[PDB]
Amino acid sequence: VLLQRISPLQIDPTIISNTMSTVSESTTQTLSPASSILGKLRPSNSDFS
Amino acid sequence: TQSLVSSMRGTLGKLKLIKSMTPMYLQQLAPVELAVIAPMLPFPPFQVP
């Protein structure tokens, strides 16, 4: 909490969800490397704790 | 992937060959129209090179 009070850095959870919107892939495939990371790596804003 | 780079090249090669009259206008008719208008202005033109 004491580092969180005076640290300038903050969260930005939407940057991965923004950058994974332009991954070229096909709808026909069953696997999805663009969408598997977003389920494996979900942000929840309680991640700096 | 395949079939993204091809459509990208097609979009660029077509957007190069788009048929617009604006670059013709800006070199043939817009300077003579500015030369027509410019004496009849209440704030006459003030230019540095």
Q: Which chain B residue is nearest to residue A23, measuring alpha carbons?
A: B1
| Token reading at A28 | 């026909």
Q: At what resolution in Å was this solved?
A: 3.4
Tell which B residues from 2 to 21 touch A, by Cβ distance under 8 Å. 4
Method: cryo-EM
Exposure string for B12-37, b = 16+ CB within 10 A, e = fewer: eeeeeeeeeeeeeeeeeeeeeeeeee
How many cross-chain Cβ pairs, A to B, lie less than 8 Å apart? Answer: 4
**What DSSP line would sit under chain B, residue for residue?**
-TTTHHHHHHHHHHHHS---SHHHHHHHTHHHHHHHHGGG-SS------
> How many Å apart are CA A18 and CA B49, to the nearest integer?
45
Tokens 């033109």, located at residue: B45
